[PDB]
Symmetry: C4
Subunit: 189 residues, 4 copies
Amino acid sequence: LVVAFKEDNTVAFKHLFLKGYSGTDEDDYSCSVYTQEDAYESIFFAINQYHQLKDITLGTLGYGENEDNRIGLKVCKQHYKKGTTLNIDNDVELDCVQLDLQDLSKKPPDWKNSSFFRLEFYRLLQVEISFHLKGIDLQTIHSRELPDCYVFQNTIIFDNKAHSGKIKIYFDSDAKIEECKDLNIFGST
Amino acid sequence: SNQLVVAFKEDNTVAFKHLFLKGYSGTDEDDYSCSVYTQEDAYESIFFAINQYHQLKDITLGTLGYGENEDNRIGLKVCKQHYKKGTMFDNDVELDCVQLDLQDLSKKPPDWKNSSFFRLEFYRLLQVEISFHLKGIDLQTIHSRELPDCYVFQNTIIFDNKAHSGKIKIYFDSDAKIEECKDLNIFGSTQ
Amino acid sequence: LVVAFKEDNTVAFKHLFLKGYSGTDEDDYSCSVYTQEDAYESIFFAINQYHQLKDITLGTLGYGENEDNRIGLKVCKQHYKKGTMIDNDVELDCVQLDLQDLSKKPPDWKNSSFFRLEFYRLLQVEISFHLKGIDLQTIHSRELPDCYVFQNTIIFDNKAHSGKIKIYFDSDAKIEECKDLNIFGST
Amino acid sequence: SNQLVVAFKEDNTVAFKHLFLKGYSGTDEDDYSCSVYTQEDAYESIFFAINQYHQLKDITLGTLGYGENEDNRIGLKVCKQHYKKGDNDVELDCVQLDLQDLSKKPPDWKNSSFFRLEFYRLLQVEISFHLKGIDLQTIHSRELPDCYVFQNTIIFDNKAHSGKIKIYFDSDAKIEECKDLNIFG
């Protein structure tokens, strides 16, 4: 459970998945956005970087299995419930979409034009992207005589819970040692 | 009973500085937010603020809406102070004002950009002042369906050239006050 | 005297004539360049900002008459004489560029043999010009007109020959009563 | 360690970092000069260094010149350490790039199989070249001219395998027996 390996990977993930990430966290969150375009650009950047991860990462990474034993990312949006001037009820509605690698690979990407991604920011509490990545620590392949395999449970949160006109973008990564699943490491062929 | 949350007033002001101040770095330069040292950057900053107001519906991430100004109309007021024309020039200062309605900004091309008002003579310019009202709702602390209180933001952007040193100091002031919502529409909402 | 007006103007001049000036000085010098392209771009930027000063400045400025009652900027270069590669012989070449020379379309000065620098033997390039400015806060109260003459100098120092050129901006302000002189935008 | 004009050695090394490290901010990131988090950035930074060496003549503001290697032929060496795919489990490949190879249009070297890196088993890439420089502040009087030989080395360090490559720039200056090579003028 090498803290350095867990930590060094997280920094690299912030640079890969957070559009415009300056290199240092802004406060408790990694960065923020103040406009609808920047919010959409940041959400779509994270998704497109996951899709193309194979040709981006400089690590010994691979896609990981999710709760259903499938590879892909989940996108959740929490909105205040609407009704029939201020058309909002305090009841929160949670919508989710699972995007498989085939869905992202499709040309044109039909997911971008979905009604799910037409956000209503005036009643939006947050958007949460979540995906799993499997990585190997090669500094222990020769030491242990069996590679230290890690499972990263990555989560990107676009928190708009303040409703102050700024969205705080958080990047969480939970690493856990695991056994090898014989999953393909991006670079190897 | 005090009902204004300082955090909500201040968090919104930070966001307005990002929306209306062109190139705003994220932190204030000194007592003023940012400065400009050329005529182009000065015009670009003036025009950026007006165009951001115009397109606010598609920019803001808050629960905002346009607010009725001092005289009950919708829109933003631009003002310029300048030493009156003379042989190199009390009441030596001349104050010209211009009220731009939502329809004036919506014309494509906005005819306001080509106005003689916006042809500034920087050698005798004291300052330019942009002023507009925004209404906002704190959803985190309403906890009620009807009777939502709204923060009335009395926003002002000042382009101070009173020093005449070659630098224009850009200030952003925002005065929040709790008020009745009074039937004004929240940008992303529909029925 | 009004130090604030002298210093506030120097800050503005650094933003107007120093290409890419970040807003704060780098060390004792304002900024530096590490390539020939950046060095040429910085020299030409200063000159072109002088030429177009009328449509750039936010102050109450005007061009200043040089020591010999002339309008324009002077550009001086210091190159080593053809050495090995006397103590040391340096070739100090100068060019005076009048406002009519800068106004000529196309600018023939850019294509001059003067501006074909040999950086391996270049000690420095120095751009110098005069600007006259008025402090309108001295006319706000009484009717006494306080005028200033700025003796501006931009120096591209390659005297170390270490691969970096240090760019210094000096400005000497002197209170000299104006004589109904031309100010940008006045009619 | 004699005739230690430390200022000249260090002033040149700063300028080298600006010429050969792509996007170098002006100050080192930590113990290394800068880092890269994507394969495209890693390739752009590698190729930027090589292309700046190729065009050094039209870039440098110093009194520089190319330096000869043990080969007695001017050029840069690129080395890559990879884990053997499958006592030594590391594989070291090295190439030399002549100035004629860099000068040919189109540069055929960019499209070579040597430059198709497998980042999952890559430990590091190392560009290494020699540059000769003269300190003109010691020839002024026509007495004793000091010639320096800079043994520059850029390292793209992926030994952590954490997804970030640390870029180190080294420069070893030595006063040598001045063999007055073309000083780009």
